[PDB]
Design a protein around this ligand. Sequence first.
Ligand SMILES: *[C@@H]1O[C@H](CO)[C@@H](O)[C@H](O)[C@H]1NC(C)=O
Ligand SMILES: *[C@@H]1O[C@H](CO)[C@@H](O)[C@H](O)[C@H]1NC(C)=O
Ligand SMILES: *[C@@H]1O[C@H](CO)[C@@H](O)[C@H](O)[C@H]1NC(C)=O
Ligand SMILES: *[C@@H]1O[C@H](CO)[C@@H](O)[C@H](O)[C@H]1NC(C)=O
Ligand SMILES: *[C@@H]1O[C@H](CO)[C@@H](O)[C@H](O)[C@H]1NC(C)=O
Ligand SMILES: *[C@@H]1O[C@H](CO)[C@@H](O)[C@H](O)[C@H]1NC(C)=O
Ligand SMILES: [Cl-]
Ligand SMILES: [Cl-]
Ligand code: NA
Lengths: 342, 189
Amino acid sequence: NHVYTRAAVAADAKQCSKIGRDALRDGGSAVDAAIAALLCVGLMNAHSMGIGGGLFLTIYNSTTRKAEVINAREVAPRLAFATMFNSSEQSQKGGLSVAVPGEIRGYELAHQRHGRLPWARLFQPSIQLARQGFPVGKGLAAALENKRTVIEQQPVLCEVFCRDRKVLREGERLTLPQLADTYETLAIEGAQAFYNGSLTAQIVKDIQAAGGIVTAEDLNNYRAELIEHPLNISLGDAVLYMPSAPLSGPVLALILNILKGYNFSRESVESPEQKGLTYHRIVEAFRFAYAKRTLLGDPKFVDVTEVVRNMTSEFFAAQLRAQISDDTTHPISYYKPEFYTP
Amino acid sequence: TAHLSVVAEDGSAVSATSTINLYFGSKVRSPVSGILFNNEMDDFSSPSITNEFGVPPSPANFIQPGKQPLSSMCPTIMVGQDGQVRMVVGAAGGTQITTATALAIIYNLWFGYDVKRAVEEPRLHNQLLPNVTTVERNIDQAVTAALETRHHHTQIASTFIAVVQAIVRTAGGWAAASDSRKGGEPAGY
Ligand SMILES: *[C@@H]1O[C@H](CO)[C@@H](O)[C@H](O)[C@H]1NC(C)=O
Ligand SMILES: *[C@@H]1O[C@H](CO)[C@@H](O)[C@H](O)[C@H]1NC(C)=O
Ligand SMILES: *[C@@H]1O[C@H](CO)[C@@H](O)[C@H](O)[C@H]1NC(C)=O
Ligand SMILES: *[C@@H]1O[C@H](CO)[C@@H](O)[C@H](O)[C@H]1NC(C)=O
Ligand SMILES: *[C@@H]1O[C@H](CO)[C@@H](O)[C@H](O)[C@H]1NC(C)=O
Ligand SMILES: *[C@@H]1O[C@H](CO)[C@@H](O)[C@H](O)[C@H]1NC(C)=O
Ligand SMILES: [Cl-]
Ligand SMILES: [Cl-]
Ligand code: NA
């Protein structure tokens, strides 16, 4: 049941939750624990996230009572352009599909602002895990099976993800010895090693060799961004902090604002008559909220100010709730999906 | 995609969601560094690529140099009027992230389900286009019937809908839950 009197980490792999917890016990901040745990998930779920990707953190300081967001999502390289892909396969595989990784700049910014433990300490348990290896978990095993063909026919992937030329199965040992060395370099040399240091030329070489266009200048210029005022909504006596565009906080805000007007409670699910109507109303709120999603984009490049103002407005939400019919769903056009600002 | 939730002894908290996008990202692994590179460029819309029958590309989310692609991620922290964290929650699952994060919040805050039940409770999803409601395998079939009599077309998810990690403050301290759909477990003290 995992109730804890002092502190808690909930990650998607048991060993990574324990690594986060150990950081907390050793005097780390919530940010130290999150970074140490994320470094571990990057190994245990290497198919899902890692230092080749990007992340967002929502952080709340109990003392100042302030929340902030750190934006370390990947960005299109300087040589990218709107018509660079003509098929889904071009946009999904190979070096041209790679955006500039932001993960390590994100960890650095968060740790500069909120760290208590030394940077190298955050990497130590993951360097050990990558060298000694670990049993393949359920999620990774499923992904390996789903991608077996691709994996098995690519020697650089089969190097770590196969055993005797076949993909690893759940319970079999995976070791990540090159990543262990990379994590050690990052721990010793800092985030600079990735973006403007000893790893940078090799990153560019690997991406370009696979047909990509990321350059050293792209890595040098990458910056994580501090957002001092995250999106928020009021729910009852609480405030919900979440990222705005380019993430989906505005969609979540609109869903909850539409639904808060129904005053759901445990009675809403106490009988099938009530429970059925309640779930209908939830699905309709999703449909209204997703109609508005296609206007969203990076707010540095697209003007989303009005869209986001509507999506976070309780009054706009009440106008949409008034259009939810208790007896029927409606065709797509009813929800007014929009691809251009009206 | 991975979602992690943390609450420290001083009451500070982090909700973090991270991704390389599709399974094994671009499928480009460095033979020297071992880094597996993302395929996040696939999260942009492109004028020449149609992903769903009758759905046009979204120009707001076209590629530009230096631009970030739209994301479904939503790492959230709910804080009470007294300044103490109430809930730390987020999800993995592509476009299902936003609906599953909504459900976990609804389930705990309004229906009164404890955190583990809020995470384990069956979910459903609709994103307007496509025009179908996906429900998980073990959803209350009275819900399925209530949706279908109201003219929703439902289909059962072949695996599951999203993965949620969450921590909620209780009288007992911090109650944590990792989603069994992925097989995580929390840790704490
Ligand atoms: C897609 O087509 C445009 C116009 O011909 C071209 O500039 C671009 O390089 C093409 N992309 C690929 C990956 O073939
Ligand atoms: C929270 O804010 C207080 C007051 O400014 C500060 O002393 C402390 O370092 C902060 N905690 C973290 C983890 O940033
Ligand atoms: C480091 O930064 C400067 C300018 O950003 C550049 O001249 C140099 O090539 C960089 N080094 C690496 C390894 O990227
Ligand atoms: C919620 O949203 C905005 C920040 O732009 C502001 O009006 C208000 O101070 C915020 N509320 C809280 C509790 O941070
Ligand atoms: C915002 O909502 C109002 C109605 O409440 C509407 O007039 C307007 O078109 C909306 N603006 C945008 C950019 O969607
Ligand atoms: C979508 O499903 C609804 C629900 O039955 C139906 O009214 C509508 O015709 C369907 N098609 C479109 C294009 O909205
Ligand atoms: Cl490796
Ligand atoms: Cl996850
Ligand atoms: Na639990």
